[PDB]
Point group: none
Chain length 121, copies 8
């Protein structure tokens, strides 16, 4: 389906494909077996332009995977600062707690990311 | 609602708002979506005077969030020794184990806080 | 955040700024991204009066960085006998071993400080 | 209450208390609210002599808390090598995995305990 | 019960005994009380030859233990690069997330094996 | 791929190839098996013009290898002052500590480069 | 406390303390927080007579600390040739490699102890 | 087990015994408890003829021990130029970095073997 193509394209960093699938009517909040949306996959993999496209197409910025992690948690886990800032300015719930009780600030402190902790602070 | 306001004030360190809300009838044991009480948030954020006031107004020192963590677990996680002492002085269950089997001591060890470890042993 | 300003002041050797920050409620044991406390930074940079001042306001003389190094380990690495003597007088554990199994004496030898070694033994 | 008192004595390392409570009909396999047995707490706290006497009293060396941890898991987590050796000599299961899938060897690797890792893979 | 004997031989690294039980008709996907198959145990224990033989006998490369972990997850945890490559060449699902939301890549970074993480891309 | 070619060209000091690959779309932040970026190898090898081209193409000056080392650390290890100055003026994290807790200053003191120690100090 | 008191005695070279502690049921292989046994501490501190009596008491000559170092590694690190010879007679494993991949010969070389390298052959 | 005897023969420098064990079917890539292969041990101990023999028998020139060191790293550590030249001629990965981020080049500079370094560059 276009949903599976979009998730694969978002994980792979295929900017053109994502744009084509979005223009062709793919579900922006399509979920894989683990509850990842394309925005989860692009935020984790560090694909900034894809994050922006998915956000323009109405992507849920606070979508949650099977462990209660939002794209913010995923991007913070991988130290993707620009993506973290885009998500924050678009209404990311900074105080969202995952199924382990952790927030993106907790993940930041855990990974010793000063710049990330500051922004999330 | 005053509970929502109290939690926000406890988290932000608004000592005077906390006292005003308490005087206006706010539930000292109000809970957020994750089972966080004002004492949980103040202890995590490092707000000692709010911790004292909340305890004076009947805060449950052994209130548990969704992951079985009490304010002592959270204060130990962030390394707030002063709040740990106050909570231990107010009946904090030093042997409470969270939903992942950890005590405040284990949590302290896990995060470098070795002086908190000693005080907890 | 006064902890971040405190760490900066202790590193830079701003004696009067450290007192102002601590009079305003700065955490004497605040930790940077690498687990350095103001005492670790002052000891490493050779700031004697800041070391003495920090210890007076409740600094953990045996606090540990991400590599298990205490301020004695850092003072020894840089050859600051004065600060080593102060920390020992304040309860420094000369037998503390870091994540590489090293003591301040081992470090002193490795760096060729025959005199600091003599002192530590 | 004898179980609770024994659990407390095992945590505190109180040989004399353990002795009297055992003579009065206490259960060596008494469980607290988290499935901890006296052997669990003694092992966790580093009370070797208590660990030894509890095993002589008939303590289940492979009892599990609410997270599937046995005393070997707790002793390894706290770096108590002497206790681990005693538990192994008394039939501890080195391949038991807790509710997080970890064995005592896994816990020893996580905490950098090279000495205990060697003993657990022997 | 050949299944239990197969699991024990694979964990013990007894190559010739694994071949004998496979000739006796043992289930290559036999599972212990934790959902471990012979391949999980051989992969965790670093037994390359047993890994290969079990794969030749039709082992499920993406079999999952009670925590959603595949033999790749276990080999990643123990830093067994050689077993990782064989598993990958036999169709191991690199994106598989366990019951803690972790991929073999996540495990590798958590355990500091950044070299294996780089392989997992 | 172009990334592999860029890393090899950067290490070999092949100014022309680097310029050709950057124009042909090569990732300036391409990573090797050890987390080395083209800038890491150029900084280590003393290839200043490659450092400049890479920085102009957007090279992350604070990229980290599998040991937490930045191009600054490597330039300091091999005593390349010119590259150290360029990196510093382009925003190199001077107080970044590697997975051994060492800063570029520490590496300088260890190798005895007083000149480099003075610039970093 | 007997083990802690034995470890302290071995570090300080107190023959009288060792004798009474051993006579009172002390474990000759008691371990401190870093996995040092009394033999490790006496070998590191240069107390030959304590090393000799601990071996007579049944000290495990190949005991490992938290970093995989045996007493032979510590005696070699400190350049204690008499203690090295005594450990060698009592079965020290000259090919033991610690957490950093080093043997007692490697250390001796790194430290210029030419005499000891020869004894290690 | 022929592997253990091969490892012992290669470390003791027993050329004829190595030839006998190789004729008996010994695994040329057998490994000790530390990931050492017979080539690692021969290269470390300076046995050029064993190195030649094992290479003729299919020894992996780039085998890695538990610290990511190749026979080249070990030979560079011990200043064995002849073995270095043979390893290079058999395809030794000169740019291979160990678990400490070091190349045979780094090791040479670290040990002062400039001649060796000059070749490795």
């Amino acid at each position: 389906d276009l949903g599976k193509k979009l998730l694969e394209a978002a994980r792979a960093g295929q900017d053109d494909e994502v744009r084509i699938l979005m223009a062709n009517g793919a579900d922006v909040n399509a979920k894989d077996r683990y509850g990842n949306t394309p925005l989860h996959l692009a935020a984790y993999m560090g694909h900034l332009e894809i994050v922006e496209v998915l956000l323009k197409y109405g992507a849920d910025v606070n979508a949650m995977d099977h462990w209660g992690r939002t794209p913010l948690h995923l991007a913070a886990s991988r130290g993707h600062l620009d993506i973290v800032e885009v998500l924050l300015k678009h209404g990311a719930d900074v105080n969202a707690q995952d199924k382990f009780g952790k927030t993106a600030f907790d993940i930041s402190i855990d990974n010793g990311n000063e710049d990330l902790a500051e922004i999330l602070q």
